[PDB]
């Protein structure tokens, strides 16, 4: 009744992949493992041994079921005065997504259909969620404080 | 029971062994 | 083997309280329930019936075990240019806590010993955690945007 | 089995009943 962790990258989950696994008991044998589109953490593939699919951490995206989250690290200036976010896609395109209104700390903007394939309807994808991280200045001179007091509301 | 991931390349070479072993034991 | 929820306010948990509970089976009988300082959600008091202590929501503080969290809703102006937070205490004092540096969205400042009594050492309290909520302006005129571009770093 | 919280005041008055009932049944 034996489990071993099968680590799968976001890209593997987006497109599917085949994974080959070596064993010894004492004959060296190969178990092959089709990983179909959009399969979730925990998914069990058993072998008369139980491979349990784990999401490999990715540094651009955080998986949220079939959705994919994108941290957008912008300046406070960008957040107050406007900016363009070049959203990366899982297949390596970039989408400019223009923001005219004030962006708020932790604000989300759904980029529809740029997520993972939903396992059972893999022609239907989840979403890419922009998640804004507004980076404050470490320090503000007395010069700036005095202007900021005049132009920002009480 | 020792398990470990293989590359496409590693995996081929290792079948050529369980094969080129089931060759000797098929004698 | 019967459970009934015993809702207890943050103030009751801070000072302790006695709770009286009416029953019928068919005699009306009273179970009394000393609630000692700092008792946590889930705490079971059984009666040959199992009262399970639940935290009543409070609108000033959010309980975090023996710690108490205080949302400080400040303006972006306050966060960049300095402010004084009048921290309320659980016994109704206010503590001014002055911030000179830039306050960051979701920043915490521990106010030591202004939390709940720790159940077994009730002379030793948990902490009050200030949790900052920085409120952005809904809108910024072109006038302000142009100044903000000049005084906030890229 | 019906349970419900009481005030300090409600609770007194209700004991004066289970008492002023265990009075009649102590006869």
From Swiss-Prot, chains A, C:
The modification Phosphothreonine is found at residue 121. Induction: By heat shock. Coiled coil: none annotated. It is found in: Cytoplasm; Nucleus; Nucleus, Nucleolus. Interacts with HSP70 and can stimulate its ATPase activity. Stimulates the association between HSC70 and HIP. Negatively regulates heat shock-induced HSF1 transcriptional activity during the attenuation and recovery phase period of the heat shock response. Stimulates ATP hydrolysis and the folding of unfolded proteins mediated by HSPA1A/B (in vitro). Interacts with DNAJC3. Interacts with HSF1 (via transactivation domain); this interaction results in the inhibition of heat shock- and HSF1-induced transcriptional activity during the attenuation and recovery phase period of the heat shock response. Interacts with BAG3. This is DnaJ homolog subfamily B member 1. The lineage of its organism: Eukaryota, Metazoa, Chordata, Craniata, Vertebrata.
Curated annotation (Swiss-Prot), chains B, D:
It is found in: Cytoplasm, Cytoskeleton; Nucleus; Cytoplasm, Cytoskeleton, Spindle; Midbody. It comes from the Eukaryota. Induction: Up-regulated in actively dividing hematopoietic precursor cells. Up-regulated in cultured erythroleukemia TF-1 cells by granulocyte-macrophage colony-stimulating factor. Strongly down-regulated during maturation of erythroid precursor cells. This is Nuclear migration protein nudC. Ubiquitous. Highly expressed in fetal liver, kidney, lung and brain. Highly expressed in adult pancreas, kidney, skeletal muscle, liver, lung, placenta, prostate, brain and heart. Reversibly phosphorylated on serine residues during the M phase of the cell cycle. Phosphorylated by PLK and other kinases. Interacts with PAFAH1B1. Interacts with PLK1. Part of a complex containing PLK1, NUDC, dynein and dynactin. Interacts with DCDC1. Interacts with EML4 (via WD repeats). It comes from Homo sapiens (Human). The modification Phosphothreonine is found at residue 7. Plays a role in neurogenesis and neuronal migration. Necessary for correct formation of mitotic spindles and chromosome separation during mitosis. Necessary for cytokinesis and cell proliferation. Belongs to the nudC family.
């Amino acid at each position: 009744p034996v489990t071993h962790d099968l680590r799968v990258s976001l890209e593997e989950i987006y497109s599917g992949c085949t994974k080959k696994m070596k064993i010894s008991h004492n004959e060296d044998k190969i178990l092959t493992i089709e990983v179909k589109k959009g399969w979730k953490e925990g998914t069990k593939i058993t072998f008369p041994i139980v491979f349990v699919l784990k999401d490999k951490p990715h540094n651009i995206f955080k998986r949220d079921g079939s959705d994919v989250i994108y941290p957008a690290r912008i300046s406070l200036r960008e957040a107050l005065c406007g900016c363009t976010v070049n959203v990366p896609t899982l297949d390596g395109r970039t989408i400019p997504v223009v923001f005219k209104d004030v962006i708020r700390p932790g604000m989300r903007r759904k980029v529809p259909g740029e997520g993972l394939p939903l396992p059972k309807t893999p022609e239907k994808r989840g979403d890419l969620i922009i998640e804004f991280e507004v980076i404050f200045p470490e320090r503000i001179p007395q010069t700036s404080r005095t202007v900021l007091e005049q132009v920002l509301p009480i | 029971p020792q398990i470990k991931e293989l590359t496409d390349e590693e995996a081929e070479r290792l079948q050529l062994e369980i094969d080129q072993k089931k060759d000797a034991e098929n004698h």
